[PDB]
Amino acid sequence: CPVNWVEHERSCYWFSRSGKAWADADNYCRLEDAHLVVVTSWEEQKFVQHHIGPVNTWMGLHDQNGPWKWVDGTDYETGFKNWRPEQPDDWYGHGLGGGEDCAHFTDDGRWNDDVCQRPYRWVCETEL
């Protein structure tokens, strides 16, 4: 793993300490030949939770193009899920335009779909 990245179970993680809109966070990870974090197990979810704390934080999961997709091609429907109860809900009520297309960890670790324009911290991941 590069300097300032954390090794965990054959992956390297980088935890931002500033916010970006989802698309810009996604681009940032690509610059590092990485991708927004893809969570595939309870063990990994806990690890990530442990390092982000109770803070809204972008992950590599979205439905901007139709169905839910992980940024690295990992299959959504057969994959791990940790949504907050009553999420995802594609809420339009924020009034910012559109529903909600981008997933983030919430303050309790569980996932919510939110407006992709929102600035949140993010996590990059690469595999060893």
Ligand X SMILES: OC[C@H]1O[C@@H](O[C@H]2[C@H](O)[C@@H](O)[C@@H](O)O[C@@H]2CO)[C@H](O)[C@@H](O)[C@H]1O
Residues that bind ligand X (CB under 6 A): 87, 89, 91, 100, 112-114
Quick one: which segment of 12-20, 28-36, 41-49, 82-90 binds a second copy (CB under 8 A)? 12-20
Residue length, the chain? 128
Asked if 110 is part of the footprint of a second copy (rule: CB under 8 A), the reply reads no
> Is 9 annotated among the ligand-binding residues?
no
Alpha helices, DSSP H, located in 53-113: none
Closest to 13 in 3D by CA, of 23, 28, 2: 2
> Is 113 annotated among the ligand-binding residues?
yes
> Is 56 annotated among the ligand-binding residues?
no
Residue choice 13, 34, 45, 100 for contact with Ca ion (CB under 5 A): 100
Asked if 18 is part of the footprint of a second copy (rule: CB under 8 A), the reply reads yes
Q: Is the CB of 44 or the CB of 100 nearer to Cl ion?
A: 100
Strand-pairing partners, residue 58, are 104, 122
Angstrom CA distances, 47 to 11, 44, 62, 117, stand at: 11, 5, 21, 26
In sequence order, which residues have a C-beta less than 8 Å from that of residue 24 and are 6 or more positions away?
A: none
Query: Which residue lies nearest ligand X, judged by its C-beta?
Result: 91
Q: Which spans of this chain sit near Ca ion (rule: CB under 5 A)? A: 38, 63, 89-91, 99-101, 112-113
